[PDB]
Ligand binder design. Structure first.
Ligand SMILES: Cc1cc2nc3c(=O)[nH]c(=O)nc-3n(C[C@H](O)[C@H](O)[C@H](O)COP(=O)(O)O)c2cc1C
Ligand SMILES: Cc1cc2nc3c(=O)[nH]c(=O)nc-3n(C[C@H](O)[C@H](O)[C@H](O)COP(=O)(O)O)c2cc1C
Ligand SMILES: [Cl-]
Ligand SMILES: [Cl-]
Ligand SMILES: [Cl-]
Ligand SMILES: [Fe+3]
Ligand SMILES: [Fe+3]
Ligand SMILES: [Fe+3]
Ligand SMILES: [Fe+3]
Ligand SMILES: [Fe+3]
Ligand SMILES: [Fe+3]
Lengths: 403, 403
C-alpha cells in the first residue's frame, strides 16, 4: 500500500490512520478523526506508540514501512499501548503477528483489558510499566506515566525526554481529520473548537484528576521539558502551552459571559418561551446560544455548556414527565458532572396542559447533575404577552447573575 | 378547493383532512394521519364535530360544503369541540368567522383551553356541556359524555343515538392516512398494528381510567347501542367490538408469550449480549423482538412492550451512567406507567470497562417506571463464550418465567 509517514522530529514519525468518514461514535458527532500512532527510532531500538481501529492495519503498516525506509531501519522492536480502547489497539493482534519478537509495553490494568479484547494474546510477551519506568532505545528514552484518571484505568502517557514529546493518549485530543498534521497548519478556530468539544464530552468529569496530574507532571520536573504534545486524535501540538492553558481553564470553570438555552417543543409554546429567555439574556450583553433537542446533538450542546456560566432547559409535559428527549441529555450531564469545574446556574421552563411535572422533574435532575437551579417558568398552553415578558425577565435575571 | 365528503350514515358525513406527509410528532412516528371531523344533519339543525390542524381550513370547508349540498342544508348550526388539541381545534377561529351564529359546544375545562390557544374567541358564544347533556338536531340527538381520564380534562365523547355512532375523540384512533375511510376497507394487520401503536403510546398510563369509563358507558346503557366508532384519527370502526375488546385486553395486560430485547452499544459487546439473550428466549418457544436504540424510535419499541410480558434492556457504561439514549426511553416509560396494565419482568444487561454503573442505574429507573427487575448481567469488555452462555441462560429464564 502507498501511504506516507510524516517526520515530526528527529527519528520520530507520525504513522497513523486517517478516518475521513466517521461522523458519530461514543455519543459524539464529528467530521472524521485520526488514530495517531508514532514511530520512535533510536540508535538500537524502534518503538511504535499505539496503533488503530480494526481493519486499518494495511494503512498503518504502509506508513510504518515508509518511516522505516526514511530512517534506514527495518523492524519494530517494541509495541507500546498507552490505552486499550479499540481505536488505538484494534490492529495489535496483526502487529504482534508481523513483529513476533516485540514485547508489548503497557500498564498492568491494560494487560487485563487487552486480553479480554484479544484472547489470542495469551501467548504474547507483555512488559507492564508503572510511573517512572523507562525504555531505552539508544540515544532516546521513553519514560512512562500512569494516567488512570479514575475512568481511563488502563491509560498512560509516554514521554520522549530528548525530543520533549509527550504522547498523551486521548488527553489533548481533538476529532479532526486533516492532511496537515500540526496544530499551526490549520485554522485556530477549528483547532480550538474541536479541542473544546473533546474536553466537554470526554474530560469534564475528570477535571479534578487532570489538575492533579498536572501537579504530578510539574513535581517530577517533566513540564519545563515539553516541546510538543502528540495526542491520539487530531493535530500535534507544537505549542503545548496553548492546550495546557485551555485545559487548565476548562478544568477550573473559566468561562466568558454566556448562557446556553436548550429546549424541546411539540406545538411551539416552549419555543416561544425559549426565544423570550434568549432575548432577555441578550439585553444584558452576554453571549447566547439556543439549541433544540429535536435537531441538535448532545455533544454540541455540552461543548457550549462548558463555556457557559448559565443554562436554561425547557420542555413540555407528557404524562407527568418532560418531553422524552431531555432524558437523554440529563443522563449524559449526570455522567459529565459539570460541577467538577463550576456549578453553573440553571433556569427551567416549559408549557403544560394541566398538571405539569416537567419543570420540577428537570429541577430534580439538573440539581443531581450538578447545576444550581435558580428558578422556573411554567405556562399553561400558549403563553400570553405578559407570560412572555416574564420569560424575558427570567433570562435577563439569569444573564445578570453570571455577569 | 375540490374535496368531497364521505357519506357514513344517513345525514352523517366525514369531512376531515388527509395529512399524507406527517412522519413524526408528539414523540410518535407515523406514515401520515387524518384529522376526522364529522357533519351530522337532522331535520332542523346541523352540527360539526371537531375540525383540524391550523392551515387546513380550505380542505375542511370544501368537504363541509360538499356535505351540506348532498343533504340540502345551508349552514353549520352547532360547532362541537370534543377536545382542545390543535390537531382538532386548529381551524375553530376560521369556523367561527364562517359561522358567526353557531355556538361552541364543549366541556367547561375545554373553554379555558380554547381561550388560552385562541384569545380572539373571548367574544364567541360558548355552550358548556356535562355528561348526559343532549343536543337535538330534529330526529337526531347528540348525547354528551365527559372523558377527562385525568390528563385529557377537556375531552368528551358525543353519541349519536339513532344511528348508534360514537364520536370518540382520540379514543380508538389510529394514525393512518388512507383514501379508504372504514376499518374493513384496509388490511387488518395495518389497522390493528396502528391501533396497538396508538394505545401503547397515548393510552397506557390511562388504562385504569379507561376501564372505569367503559364501566360507566355500560352503566348508562349506551354500549348496547354502539354500531360504529368514529375517532379523530384514522379509520371508522364498522366493527366497534373489535377495538373495544382489544382495548380491554391492552388495559388489563392481556399478552401472548413475548420478550422485547432493547439495547444500545458502542463497540458491539452489549449487542453480542442482546443476541445471546434473544437466542436464550427463543429456545423456550416464545416470540422475540430485538430493537437497537441507535436506530429505532421509542414509539415502535413501546408498541411491542404493550404486547410483551418481559423486556430486556442493555447498554454500555460511560462515566458511571448508561449510554445516554436509554435516558430518553426510560423517561418515556416513566410517563407511560406500564404497571397500570401489567407489571412486566425485566432483565438489565451491559458491558463495561471498569467500575460499571449502567446496569445499576437502569435497574433503578425501570423499577421506578414499574417493571419487575429480576436479573442483572454485567460483563467486562468483550464477553467470553461462558459469559455469552450466561446471557443465553438469562434470556431463557426470562422467557420461561412468562410462560
Ligand atoms: C402525548 C401528550 C401527553 C400530554 N400529557 C400531559 C400531562 O400529563 N400533563 C400536562 O400538564 N400536559 C400534558 N400534555 C399537554 C402539553 O404539555 C401542552 O399541550 C403544552 O402546552 C405543550 O407545549 P409545547 O407547545 O412546547 O409543545 C400532553 C400532550 C400530549 C401530546
Ligand atoms: C467515553 C467513554 C467513557 C467510558 N466510561 C466508562 C466508565 O465510566 N466505567 C466503565 O466501567 N466503563 C466505561 N467505558 C468503557 C465501556 O463501558 C466499555 O468499553 C464497554 O465494553 C462498552 O461496551 P459496548 O461494546 O457494548 O459498547 C467508557 C467508554 C467510553 C468510550
Ligand atoms: Cl447517538
Ligand atoms: Cl522485519
Ligand atoms: Cl423525537
Ligand atoms: Fe471506541
Ligand atoms: Fe481515543
Ligand atoms: Fe399522570
Ligand atoms: Fe398536537
Ligand atoms: Fe388527536
Ligand atoms: Fe465516575
Amino acid at each position: 500500500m502507498k501511504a506516507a509517514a510524516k517526520r515530526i522530529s528527529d527519528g520520530v514519525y507520525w504513522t497513523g490512520v486517517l478516518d475521513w468518514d466517521l461522523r458519530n461514535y461514543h455519543g459524539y458527532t464529528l467530521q472524521g478523526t485520526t488514530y495517531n500512532a508514532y514511530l520512535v527510532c533510536g540508535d538500537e531500538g524502534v518503538a511504535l506508540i499505539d496503533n488503530s481501529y480494526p481493519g486499518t492495519f494495511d494503512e498503518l503498516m504502509a506508513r510504518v514501512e515508509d518511516a522505516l525506509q526514511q530512517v534506514g531501519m527495518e523492524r519494530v522492536d517494541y509495541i507500546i499501548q498507552n490505552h486499550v480502547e479499540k481505536d488505538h489497539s484494534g490492529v495489535l493482534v496483526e502487529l504482534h503477528r508481523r513483529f513476533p519478537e516485540a514485547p508489548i509495553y503497557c500498564t498492568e490494568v491494560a494487560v487485563k483489558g487487552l486480553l479480554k479484547h484479544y484472547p489470542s494474546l495469551r501467548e504474547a510477551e507483555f512488559m507492564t510499566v508503572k510511573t517512572g519506568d523507562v525504555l531505552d532505545l539508544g540515544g532516546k528514552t521513553l519514560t512512562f506515566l500512569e494516567t488512570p484518571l479514575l475512568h481511563w484505568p488502563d491509560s498512560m502517557f509516554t514521554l520522549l525526554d530528548e525530543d520533549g514529546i509527550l504522547f498523551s493518549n486521548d488527553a489533548f485530543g481533538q476529532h479532526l481529520c486533516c492532511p496537515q498534521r500540526l496544530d499551526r497548519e490549520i485554522p485556530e478556530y477549528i483547532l480550538m473548537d474541536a479541542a473544546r468539544k473533546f474536553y466537554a464530552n470526554l474530560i469534564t468529569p475528570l477535571s479534578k484528576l487532570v489538575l492533579k496530574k498536572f501537579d504530578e507532571v510539574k513535581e517530577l520536573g517533566l513540564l519545563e521539558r515539553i516541546q510538543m504534545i502528540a495526542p491520539s486524535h487530531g493535530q500535534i501540538w507544537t505549542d503545548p502551552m496553548k492546550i495546557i492553558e485551555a485545559y487548565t481553564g476548562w478544568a477550573t470553570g473559566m468561562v466568558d459571559e454566556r448562557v446556553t438555552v436548550i429546549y424541546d417543543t411539540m406545538h411551539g409554546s416552549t419555543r416561544k418561551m425559549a426565544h423570550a429567555i434568549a432575548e432577555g439574556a441578550m439585553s444584558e450583553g452576554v453571549d447566547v446560544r439556543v439549541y433544540c433537542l429535536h435537531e441538535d446533538d448532545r455533544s454540541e450542546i455540552v461543548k457550549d455548556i462548558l463555556e457557559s456560566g448559565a443554562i436554561a432547559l425547557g420542555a413540555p409535559t407528557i404524562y407527568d414527565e418532560p418531553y422524552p428527549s431531555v432524558g437523554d441529555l440529563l443522563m449524559y450531564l449526570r455522567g459529565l458532572k459539570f460541577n467538577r469545574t463550576l456549578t453553573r446556574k440553571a433556569l427551567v421552563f416549559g408549557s403544560m396542559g394541566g398538571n405539569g411535572g416537567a419543570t420540577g422533574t428537570m429541577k430534580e435532575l439538573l440539581a443531581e447533575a450538578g447545576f444550581d437551579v435558580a428558578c422556573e417558568e411554567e405556562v399553561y398552553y400558549v403563553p400570553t404577552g405578559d407570560e412572555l415578558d416574564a420569560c424575558f425577565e427570567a433570562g435577563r435575571k439569569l444573564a445578570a447573575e453570571i455577569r
